[PDB]
Design a protein around this nucleic acid. Structure first.
Ligand SMILES: [Mg+2]
Length: 480
RNA sequence: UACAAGAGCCUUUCU
RNA sequence: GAAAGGCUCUUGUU
């Protein structure tokens, strides 16, 4: 048996605006639209965006902290006949003006602006870049759609040279929209070490009165009928009081293994980074776990919790912070619709962002809820299920649901509220980037096609070093 | 591969 | 049933 059991429901939710809904169980349920957190920005004005219907924009808004870009480069892998230097100059001008309007001043044209062909030319030229322009902060790599050049660029920048690289498709260079450039600039500001925005500090739940770390974990697996290809487990952790900046750890682990075998070491490194950054050990630990089925609830809860506790024991003598273990499930057949036409959203007629249901469709004796935190524009919105497998922090339903909503609003690649909290999304992004690293490790030997070359040519140590990113990359948000 | 979100086709073994 | 992975497609945004 297992010595750990999930805590029951501490109470029912009361905060938010009451909204009748229908669910395919039709079962008439009652949700609560949580009010969106105010998004605090920077600049001279320090604008406070109010997410309207799940969405806010970057018009008249500057970054909370903007990173000036004095040195950057452009490597165009698109065909020169298809992406002319006129197009590149127009893209540079439009991107510079949008970035300056967003509080991210780019001082002048890139020093390097050259054309290259093939993935095999990525690693030399990139190395040449690191050997030519000191203080280089970014390379804009233009790509003609799908190519191995993308994964080779990602591998070289992340796990080889420690270089921040942003890729743009060719079709977004010839025709440029202000929204595309603004989202690009969001990614640039995140990748270079700046914070785009924070939640309004006076509107946060009381859990931020004490030091706290937010952990997001996700394991991706290759298709079945395999065993040469391993699973990839990624755990990210928030590195400051404003839950925006995240550090990442990644591990190659056994084929189709769901529990994170090396979770204790990853959590230990993340806690060490948190103590280095905030100079305070986390009093509370919030763990958002993605990609765990119902039938494997307890095993993960038996292992990973212990691992986290082990990391705490390995952090300092007599250090047992309260641990909150929640599992995120975007995949389920639970659909929610508004009962009256006056509350439907857009053309698609979805439910509003913030719709939280913790009654009548959840587990009667367990702490779980549904939260639709994203604005649906097509079809039927799919809310995210959050089941609290462990709660040493004595959370209430209101505080945990509001914290989940604000974490969903902390996603930084867009000015939108998304379906899952930012740590889970970042764990997914790190897992995908690690899979790109693993794929482009085998780019000179794409398929191998050998007996001994495939029997013991991809041993676990080599892939473990393959997913490990550079030292200059480890502390940054390369995955965004 | 600017981003989010939702329906589809193809490996995929539990069958 | 699920790991979600590719291929796309659709609505788009400031
Ligand atoms: Mg994933």
């Amino acid at each position: 048996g297992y010595a750990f059991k999930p805590p029951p429901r501490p109470d029912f939710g009361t905060s938010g605006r009451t909204i009748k809904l229908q669910a395919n169980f039709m079962t008439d349920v009652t949700g609560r639209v949580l009010q969106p957190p105010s998004i605090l920005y920077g600049g001279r004005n320090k604008a406070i965006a109010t997410p309207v219907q799940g969405v806010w924009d970057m018009r008249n808004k500057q970054f909370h902290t903007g990173i000036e870009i004095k040195v950057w480069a452009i490597a165009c892998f698109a065909p020169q006949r298809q992406c002319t230097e006129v197009h590149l100059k127009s893209f540079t001008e439009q991107l510079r003006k949008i970035s300056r309007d967003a509080g991210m001043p780019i001082q002048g044209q890139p020093c390097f602006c050259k054309y290259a062909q093939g993935a095999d030319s990525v690693e030399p030229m990139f190395r040449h870049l690191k050997n030519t322009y000191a203080g280089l902060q970014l390379v804009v790599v233009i790509l003609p759609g799908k190519t191995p050049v993308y994964a080779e660029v990602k591998r070289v920048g992340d796990t080889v040279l420690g270089m921040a690289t942003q890729c743009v498709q060719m079709k977004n260079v010839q025709r440029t929209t202000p929204q595309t450039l603004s989202n690009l600039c969001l990614k640039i500001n995140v990748k270079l070490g700046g914070v785009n925005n924070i939640l309004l500090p006076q509107g946060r739940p009381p859990v931020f009165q004490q030091p706290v770390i937010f952990l997001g974990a996700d394991v991706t697996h290759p298709p079945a009928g395999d065993g040469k290809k391993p699973s990839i487990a990624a755990v990210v952790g928030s590195m400051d009081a404003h839950p925006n900046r995240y550090c990442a750890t990644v591990r190659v682990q056994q084929h189709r293994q769901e529990i994170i075998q090396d979770l204790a070491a990853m959590v230990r490194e993340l806690l060490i980074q948190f103590y280095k950054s905030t100079r305070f050990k986390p009093t509370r630990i919030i763990f958002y776990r993605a990609g765990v089925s119902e039938g494997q609830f307890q095993q993960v809860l038996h292992h990973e919790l212990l691992a986290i506790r082990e990391a705490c024991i390995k952090l300092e003598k007599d250090y047992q912070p309260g641990i909150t273990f929640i599992v995120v499930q975007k995949r389920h057949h639970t659909r929610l619709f508004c009962t009256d036409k006056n509350e439907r959203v857009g053309k698609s007629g979805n439910i509003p962002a913030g719709t939280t249901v913790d009654t009548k469709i959840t587990h009667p004796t367990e702490f779980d809820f549904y939260l639709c935190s994203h604005a649906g524009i097509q079809g039927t919105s799919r809310p995210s299920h959050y089941h609290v497998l462990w709660d040493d922090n004595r959370f209430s339903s209101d505080e945990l649901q509001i914290l989940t909503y604000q974490l969903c609003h902390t996603y930084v690649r867009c000015t939108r509220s998304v379906s899952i909290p930012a740590p889970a999304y970042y764990a997914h992004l790190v897992a995908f980037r690690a899979r790109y690293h693993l794929v482009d490790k085998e780019h000179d030997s794409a398929e191998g096609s050998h007996t001994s070359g495939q029997s013991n040519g991809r041993d676990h140590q080599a892939l473990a070093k393959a997913v490990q990113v550079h030292q200059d990359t480890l502390r940054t948000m390369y995955f965004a």
